[PDB]
């Protein structure tokens, strides 16, 4: 889409309709006449466009009104209201901009932010933009969290997020114009290569891939159409559902063979009844011929009864020779109607061993995408966010993704090496207690009006707790934390003196031997300016490879590669790195998934802030004090960088509305 409607789309909003959020702040408008709504909508879209067309500089209320036109520029409270709403909720003037109106003289309210993940940073920057006293506590010695980027010499390789998923309505689109990220597109071509070391051929490649996609649509049909969604008390997983589909496919393969070979017997059986008839006719014929012979022996001249005899016997014999010729007729039809069936068998197998194995690699790639065994994904919900996908080719960050969190961190009060251990929140405020990771008995206390927790879900999940809430989080929150899924996948980074692979190719599979190892080193990436290949470990494998050493891993890596490019084309790798995200204590995994028996809804629960009890009993209800952002809190963009970034934007808006008030609602 383009013009002002391009902007609405590029900001993830319907260009011709007011959102539920806007209804909330603009209920005068949206409860009123159409005419007004359109004016509103325009002002909105227009402002967006302005910001979008140039996000390296702040868009002020003045700048906006300047470039509006009558009738729109006529009502300046409405313009102001809109511009302010937008600004507040990070629709405009987010990321990194030059500010016109330099920072408020002194600040108002104080927030502690747990984690300088992207969600963290994004929210900080916002709040600081809104004149707040913000400080972030990062446990690590670097920003970015699960945006990790390896750098040594000229080697640059993300151990964390790696892909931008299409700029079509992606906040990262904006950020990329604000930060020199060097975006290469990913070429979707991906050769596979069987355990042996030799390519799969286009033939199979495509015929398996297509069966895969076919088996997916299938699962979906079980879910929505047949309602196959509980299995004797238990939510059904995608994994389960897929087997059930595959079985039913194997079965129908045989039900077919059965009926086709059952036509064969039903056919020969007729043939047997006919051959019988035929053999008993050859007899009655053999014997009447005898008879007619015997009766032509009586030599003429003769009485008429003996003449009759010959003639009758004659007719009777020709009659029966009709019949036997009409049966040999039939016998001929049937007899070919059998070289007919025997020429068209149905298919012998549903999928061969070589097939079912390639098909695994397609399932590994799902396990990669969801960071989990498909046996854990919710059938009904695993893909529930497919509706919000961006448009555009996926991409990589050739200069490394860290460039972003780093960028965002500038200007900001970030305490590195500071592990939060306890969150205390109460009617009149909060205190957060953290330690210093390098010496742990050193201890810190931060008092604030509000806490924003960007702790990873794997962390929120630790038993026993790595962070303690005081008071404890309500049951509703903790149930959501159990229910939700937090998966894992790892990377192996391979640095070489020279490119020995196809430089026009970004991806390339390795098919595993077993169903069980499908995700082990199943996929490699040529992404970077230097000679670096990067290899995913996903699915069940991910979890277990953490427990094997780096050499043992890099072994299997090179073994695969030598296999595919030849024993002597594959040198010793100069530098190697191996992720272990499930082990990493500030992650405890890689990202969330919709586990079986979760829904999208839990993501919404993850985001609802917590409002402490009143201090003195019968005092009025507090303000909320404890807020949440991150990958796990955004129902519509889970598990991604932008998703995080977005949840940051979100909470900052929310927090500010709470402590600075929101003059834009009147």
């Amino acid at each position: 889409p383009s013009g002002v409607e391009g902007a609405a789309f590029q900001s993830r909003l319907p260009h011709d309709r007011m959102t539920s959020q806007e209804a909330a702040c603009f209920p005068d408008i949206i409860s009123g006449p159409q005419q007004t709504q359109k004016v509103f909508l325009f002002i909105r879209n227009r402002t967006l466009q302005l910001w979008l067309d140039n996000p390296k500089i702040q868009l002020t209320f003045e700048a906006t009104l300047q470039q509006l036109e009558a009738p729109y520029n006529s009502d300046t409270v409405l313009v102001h209201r809109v511009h302010s709403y937008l600004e507040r909720h990070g629709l405009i003037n987010f990321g990194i901009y030059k500010r016109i109106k330099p920072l408020p003289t002194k600040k108002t309210g104080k927030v502690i932010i747990i984690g300088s993940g992207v969600s963290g940073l994004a929210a900080a920057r916002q709040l600081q933009s809104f004149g707040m006293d913000v400080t972030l506590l990062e446990a690590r010695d670097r920003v970015g969290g699960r945006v990790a980027t390896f750098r040594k010499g000229n080697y640059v390789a993300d151990l964390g997020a790696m892909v931008v998923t299409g700029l079509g309505g992606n906040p990262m689109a904006v950020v990329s114009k604000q930060v020199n990220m060097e975006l290469a597109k990913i070429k979707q071509k991906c050769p596979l290569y069987e355990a042996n070391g030799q390519a799969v051929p286009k033939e199979k490649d495509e015929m398996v891939e297509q069966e895969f996609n076919r088996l997916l649509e299938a699962t979906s049909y079980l879910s929505h159409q047949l309602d196959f969604n509980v299995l004797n008390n238990k939510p059904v997983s995608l994994g389960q559902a897929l087997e059930v589909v595959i079985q039913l496919q194997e079965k129908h393969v045989k039900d077919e063979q059965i009926e086709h070979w059952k036509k064969i017997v039903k056919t020969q059986e007729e043939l047997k009844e006919l051959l019988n008839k035929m053999v008993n006719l050859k007899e009655k014929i053999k014997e009447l011929h005898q008879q007619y012979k015997e009766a032509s022996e009586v030599k003429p001249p003769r009485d008429i009864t003996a003449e009759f005899l010959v003639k009758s016997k004659h007719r009777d014999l020709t009659a029966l020779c009709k019949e036997y010729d009409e049966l040999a007729e039939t016998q001929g039809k049937l007899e070919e109607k059998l070289q007919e069936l025997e020429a068209n068998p149905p298919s012998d197998v549903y999928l061969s061993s070589r097939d079912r194995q390639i098909l695994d690699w397609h399932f590994a790639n799902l396990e990669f995408a969801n960071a989990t065994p498909l046996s854990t994904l919710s059938l009904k919900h695993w893909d529930q966010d497919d509706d919000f996908e961006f448009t555009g080719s996926h991409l990589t960050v050739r200069n490394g993704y860290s460039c972003v969190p780093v960028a965002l961190a500038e200007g900001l009060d970030i305490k590195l090496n500071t592990a939060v251990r306890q969150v205390r929140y109460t009617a009149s405020g909060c205190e957060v207690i953290a330690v210093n990771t390098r010496s742990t008995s050193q201890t810190f206390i931060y008092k604030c009006d509000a806490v924003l927790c960007t702790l990873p879900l794997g962390v929120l999940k630790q038993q026993p707790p790595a962070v303690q809430f005081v008071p404890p989080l309500p049951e509703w929150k903790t149930s959501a934390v159990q229910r939700m899924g937090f998966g894992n996948l790892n990377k192996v980074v391979l640095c070489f003196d020279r490119v020995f692979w196809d430089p026009s190719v970004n991806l390339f599979g390795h098919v595993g031997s077993t169903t069980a190892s499908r995700g082990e080193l199943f996929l490699f990436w040529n992404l970077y300016k230097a000679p670096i290949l990067l290899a995913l470990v996903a699915g069940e494998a991910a979890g277990i490879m953490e427990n094997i050493s780096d050499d043992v891993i890099v072994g299997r890596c090179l073994a695969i590669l030598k296999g595919i490019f030849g024993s002597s084309a594959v040198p010793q790798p100069k530098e190697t790195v191996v992720s272990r995200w499930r082990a990493d204590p500030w992650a405890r995994g890689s990202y969330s998934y919709v586990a079986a028996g979760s829904s999208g809804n839990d993501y919404d629960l993850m985001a609802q802030p917590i409002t402490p009890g009143p201090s003195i009993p019968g005092a009025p209800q507090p303000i909320p004090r404890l807020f949440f952002a991150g990958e796990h809190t955004i129902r519509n963009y889970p598990a991604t960088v932008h998703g995080a970034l977005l949840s940051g934007l979100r909470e900052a808006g929310r927090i500010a509305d709470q402590f600075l008030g929101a003059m834009y609602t009147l």
């Binding site: 076919r214 088996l215 649509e217 299938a218 049909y221 079980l222 159409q225 047949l226 196959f228 299995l231 087997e243 059930v244 589909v245 079985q247 039913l248 496919q249 194997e250 079965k251 129908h252 045989k254 039900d255 063979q257 059965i258 070979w261 059952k262 064969i264 017997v265 020969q268 059986e269 043939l271 047997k272 051959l275 019988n276 035929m278 053999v279 006719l281 050859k282 014929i285 053999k286 011929h289 007619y292 008429i304 009864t305 003449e307 009759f308 003639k311 009758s312 004659h314 007719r315 014999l317 020709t318 009659a319 020779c321 036997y324 040999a328």
Partner: protein
């Protein structure tokens, strides 16, 4: 509305492969065996029919008589009349046969004869004696 093309998933079937853990491989073995059971039965008849086939060897060739191709006539030699009465005894109303036997009378003349000589050859009686068989 409907599955993908050539994927099969009936309500009923789904249930049968999900009744328990190996209710899956149960169903798929009864089929594996059903199949071998049919497949052998085929060889049985294939074998039975191959033996009946060998019994018709030679066809009916040394048993076929040459062709009487002969010119349908209108008068009834007494010879012919007698052949007919006897044909009637042996064939009843199979005018077609009776014509073939007599050699040179159409299926109708044969019919006509019946009503003409009904009196003289007591066909009434002759026919009722055919019926005693």
């Amino acid at each position: 509305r409907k599955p993908p093309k050539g994927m099969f998933l009936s309500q009923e079937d789904v249930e049968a492969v999900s009744a328990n853990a190996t209710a899956a491989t149960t169903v798929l073995r009864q089929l594996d065996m059903e199949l071998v059971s049919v497949k052998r039965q085929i060889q049985n008849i294939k074998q039975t029919n191959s033996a009946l086939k060998e019994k018709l060897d030679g066809g009916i060739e040394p048993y076929r008589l040459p062709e009487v191709i002969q010119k349908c006539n209108a008068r009834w030699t007494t010879e012919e009349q007698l052949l007919a009465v006897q044909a009637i005894r042996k064939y009843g109303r199979d005018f077609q046969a009776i014509s073939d036997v007599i050699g040179n009378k159409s299926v109708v003349q044969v019919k006509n004869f019946f009503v003409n000589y009904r009196r003289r050859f007591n066909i009434d009686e002759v026919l009722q004696e055919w019926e005693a068989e």
